[PDB]
Design an enzyme around this catalytic site. Structure first.
Site, short mmCIF file in Angstrom:
data_model
loop_
_atom_site.label_atom_id
_atom_site.label_comp_id
_atom_site.label_asym_id
_atom_site.label_seq_id
_atom_site.Cartn_x
_atom_site.Cartn_y
_atom_site.Cartn_z
N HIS A 290 1.77 4.78 -2.89
CA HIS A 290 1.88 6.18 -2.55
C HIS A 290 3.19 6.83 -2.87
O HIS A 290 3.19 7.82 -3.57
CB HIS A 290 1.59 6.33 -1.05
CG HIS A 290 0.22 6.07 -0.71
ND1 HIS A 290 -0.71 7.06 -0.80
CD2 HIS A 290 -0.45 4.91 -0.27
CE1 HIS A 290 -1.91 6.58 -0.35
NE2 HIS A 290 -1.73 5.25 -0.03
N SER B 189 -2.71 0.75 -5.70
CA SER B 189 -2.21 -0.38 -4.92
C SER B 189 -3.21 -1.58 -4.89
O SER B 189 -2.92 -2.57 -4.26
CB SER B 189 -1.89 0.04 -3.47
OG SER B 189 -3.03 0.60 -2.82
N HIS C 294 0.84 -1.20 0.00
CA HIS C 294 0.00 0.00 0.00
C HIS C 294 0.87 1.24 0.00
O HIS C 294 0.64 2.17 -0.80
CB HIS C 294 -0.90 0.02 1.23
CG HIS C 294 -1.96 1.14 1.23
ND1 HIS C 294 -3.18 1.04 0.57
CD2 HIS C 294 -1.94 2.45 1.84
CE1 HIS C 294 -3.85 2.23 0.71
NE2 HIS C 294 -3.10 3.08 1.50
N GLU D 183 -5.62 9.64 -2.05
CA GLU D 183 -6.00 8.22 -2.21
C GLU D 183 -6.70 7.79 -3.50
O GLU D 183 -6.37 6.73 -4.02
CB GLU D 183 -6.94 7.84 -1.15
CG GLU D 183 -6.36 8.01 0.22
CD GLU D 183 -5.15 7.12 0.43
OE1 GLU D 183 -5.02 6.05 -0.12
OE2 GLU D 183 -4.32 7.51 1.18
#
Length: 252
Positions: free
Chosen positions: A120, A179, A115, A160
């Site tokens: 990110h 992700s 993740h 996000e």
């Protein structure tokens, strides 16, 4: 639960942890080509992410830093909203040093080293983006806890789950999308979601559900849109958002 890193940052993962990184890596890589934004594509390359082992943070950090002053900090599994934002504020992206389990491959609520380092970090190698994430964190002090839910709403629809309409088409920047194998296809190919023109007040008025494929995404035409937004006084967009009412959910 996480590994505690050694004197020099290195972390003793064994084979199985590495295979799951591998299966996660291998299958997301395939789907990226027509879906992730160019900046994500190159951030991944810049960051040296192998499809083979879980990275060691020092090397990844060193690479991030040289692009935009960001670094990665190892943390435990369940850090708090405050601890997240205090770290982003000093230009560190938190990386919990565990990976999801074989059983928890497809959907997973507690964010892991995949993740983070895959979804990110790669967008933090783009300068305007990295500066917007940092300014955004910073300004979430300045704000009392009463306002973090709205600030955390806005974060959800940008960092996000945000999309970017490019000259070659719709792409995704959101680390929550990139992700996840489900989101990554759906976000830019399904006829179900509503895709809205990114505007601060309306994102502030939009509710959301964590565990579910998103029924609304917000679309930016440049990371500069997110930058002007946070160099402008939030606060004012937030009130306003409150005087007009919260919108009704598209989900249930």
């Amino acid at each position: 639960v996480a590994h505690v890193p050694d004197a020099q940052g290195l972390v003793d993962y064994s084979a199985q942890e590495n295979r799951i990184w591998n299966i996660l890596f291998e299958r997301q890589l395939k789907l990226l080509p027509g879906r992730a934004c160019d900046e994500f594509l190159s951030g991944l390359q810049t960051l040296g992410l192998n499809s083979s082992t879980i990275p060691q943070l020092p090397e990844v950090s060193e690479r991030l830093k040289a692009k935009t002053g960001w670094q990665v900090a190892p943390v435990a599994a369940l850090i708090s909203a405050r601890e997240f934002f205090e770290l982003l504020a000093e230009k560190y992206f938190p990386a919990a040093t565990f990976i999801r389990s074989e059983e928890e491959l497809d959907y997973v609520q507690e964010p892991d080293i995949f993740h983070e380092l895959f979804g990110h970090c790669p967008m933090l190698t783009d300068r305007v983006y990295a500066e917007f994430v940092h300014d955004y964190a910073c300004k979430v002090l300045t704000f009392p806890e009463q306002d973090w839910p709205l600030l955390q709403r806005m974060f959800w629809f940008t960092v996000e789950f945000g999309l970017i309409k490019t000259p070659k088409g719709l792409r995704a920047y959101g680390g929550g999308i990139l992700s996840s194998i489900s989101e990554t296809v759906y976000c830019v190919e399904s006829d179900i979601p509503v895709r809205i023109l990114f505007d601060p007040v309306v994102a502030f008025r939009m509710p959301y559900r964590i565990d579910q494929l998103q029924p609304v995404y917000f679309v930016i035409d440049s990371y500069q849109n997110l930058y002007d937004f946070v160099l402008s006084d939030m606060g004012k967009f937030m009130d306003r958002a409150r005087e007009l009412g919260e919108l009704p959910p598209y989900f249930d």
